[PDB]
A paper describes a structure:
Crystallization of L2 lipase was done using a counter diffusion method in collaboration with JAXA (Japanese Aerospace Exploration Agency) under the JAXA-UPM Protein Crystal Growth (PCG) #1 Flight 1 program. The best Shape 2 L2 lipase crystal was diffracted at high resolution (1.5 Å) and belongs to the orthorhombic space group P212121, with unit-cell parameters a = 72.0, b = 81.8, c = 83.4 Å, α = β = γ = 90°. The core structure L2 lipase is made of a seven-stranded parallel sheet that is surrounded by a number of alpha helices; namely alpha helices 1 and 13 on one side, and alpha helices 2, 4, 5, 9,10, 11 and 12 on the opposite site of the structure. Based on the structural alignment of L2 lipase with other structurally-known lipases, the Ser113, Asp317 and His358 were assigned as the catalytic triad. L2 lipase contains the Ala-Xaa-Ser-Xaa-Gly pentapeptide, which is the conserved form in Bacillus spp. The lid of the L2 lipase structure is formed by helix α6. In the L2 lipase structure, the Ca2+ is coordinated in an octahedral environment via Gly286 O, Glu360 O Asp365 O, Pro366 O and two water molecules. The Zn2+ is coordinated in a tetrahedral environment by two histidine N12 atoms (His81 and His87) located in helix α3, and two aspartate O atoms (Asp61 and Asp238). The Zn2+ is approximately 19 Å away from the catalytic serine residue, and is thus unlikely to participate in catalysis.
In this paper, we report the crystallization and the crystal structure of a 43 kDa recombinant thermostable lipase isolated from Bacillus sp. L2. The structure possesses the known fold of the a/b hydrolase family, and contains both a calcium ion and a zinc ion. Lipases catalyze both the hydrolysis of triglycerides to glycerols and free fatty acids over an oil-water interface, and also the hydrolysis and transesterification of other esters as well as the synthesis of esters and exhibiting enantioselective properties. Bacterial lipases are members of the structural superfamily of α/β hydrolases whose enzymic activity results from the catalytic triad Ser-His-Asp, similar to that found in serine proteinases.
Residue numbers in the entry: 8 to 385
The structure:
């Protein structure tokens, strides 16, 4: 089965960002390493800020080909376009009984899980609405499709991240987007006339104008439904939103699930908080990690177990969905088990180091992805 790479709440296609890769960043090109070592690998690029639902509908069309269909019921409920972009299809073999391994980072792991759930079970709401209103139904919502062999998640907020609870989260989250642009040598205050980074917000009718800086565009997005509605990455990223997703997005017994967790902090002896390590990406170290390593909220069950983090996501959130979930999670024992989360361990690498967007010479990123690809091929 080929590997398909899937980004989180930042991420872009291989020709975007002047070729600086999300999967590899300053370290190289992970897809190229995998292909060069015999592991046939492709990359998806979906709306980074869009809901997991919208992203799963986009991923489906990107993989098999055709016009993105968000579901008549869903589009009506949230007030966005039902149909999106049209794709040629990266992998028409999936229409001929082929299967794929998905390797996903950050919120990509929520999207990958949801894509499996929709492939396997469809959506009863969409099936009923299509019957009631005499409209077409995407095959994604029928159920009985099985093309995902495995989902691997890396630093995924399966139970959310407490970052969303930060006082000025709206402004800091967009400053994070700017920090990632800067890592690619893309400035947030420059009036680019080429596309650079397409947020893929056709369903909401939003697009950056030529000559409009990312600073100015992001101020528009903050006030738009991709930030202010419940149909958003923002909603799904929160502890409450992730729990709601967990209530319906369950592990398929036909799919292998693997999780990798990340941590980049040390514990202070005096108040038990977690503090960022030397080498954490500067933005997380200064803006995000202090909060993540000290924020507790007893009424939500956010206790000391939540303080360890990788600069963006609480480490405890990453081994698999727990809150609101019935999925089982087991420590990897040398044999991958189907239908459950195989916890592949916790790595001392930060949220952006693990994809190479931030440097870390002590992390052999190439060996990490090659070892994972071997595990999936075996
Ligand atoms: Ca670093
Ligand atoms: Zn939507």
């Amino acid at each position: 089965a080929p590997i398909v790479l899937l980004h989180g709440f930042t991420g872009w296609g291989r020709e975007e960002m002047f070729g600086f890769k999300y999967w590899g960043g300053v370290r190289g090109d992970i897809e190229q390493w995998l292909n060069d070592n015999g592991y046939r690998t492709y990359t998806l690029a979906v709306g980074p800020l869009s809901s997991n639902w919208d992203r799963a509908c986009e991923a489906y069309a990107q993989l098999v080909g055709g016009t993105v269909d968000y579901g008549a019921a869903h589009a009506a409920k949230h007030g966005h376009a039902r149909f999106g972009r049209t794709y040629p299809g990266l992998l028409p073999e999936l229409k001929r009984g082929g299967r794929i391994h998905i390797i996903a980072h950050s919120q990509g792991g929520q999207t990958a899980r949801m894509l499996v759930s929709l492939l396997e079970n469809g959506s009863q709401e969409e099936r009923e609405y299509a019957k009631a209103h005499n409209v077409s139904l995407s095959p994604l919502f029928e159920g009985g499709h099985h093309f995902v062999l495995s989902v691997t998640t890396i630093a995924t907020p399966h139970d959310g991240t407490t970052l969303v609870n930060m006082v000025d989260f709206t402004d800091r989250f967009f400053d994070l987007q700017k920090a990632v642009l800067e890592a690619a040598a893309v400035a947030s205050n420059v009036p680019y006339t080429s596309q650079v980074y397409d947020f893929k917000l056709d369903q909401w009718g939003l697009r950056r104008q030529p000559g409009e800086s990312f600073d100015h565009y992001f101020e528009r997005l903050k006030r738009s439904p991709v930030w202010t509605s419940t149909d958003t990455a923002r909603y799904d990223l929160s502890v409450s939103g992730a729990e709601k997703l967990n209530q319906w997005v369950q592990a398929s017994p036909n799919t292998y699930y693997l999780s990798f967790s990340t941590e980049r902090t040390y514990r202070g002896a005096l108040t038990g908080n977690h503090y960022p390590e030397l080498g954490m990406n500067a933005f997380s170290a200064v803006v995000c990690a202090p909060f993540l390593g000290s924020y507790r909220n007893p009424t939500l069950g956010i206790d000391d177990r939540w303080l360890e983090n990788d600069g963006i996501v609480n480490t405890v959130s990453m081994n698999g969905p727990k809150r609101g979930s019935s999925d089982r999670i087991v420590p990897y024992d040398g044999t991958l088990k189907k239908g459950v989360w195989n916890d592949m361990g916790t790595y001392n690498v930060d949220h952006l180091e693990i994809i190479g967007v931030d440097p870390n010479p002590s992390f052999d990123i190439r060996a990490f992805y090659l070892r994972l690809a071997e595990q999936l091929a075996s």
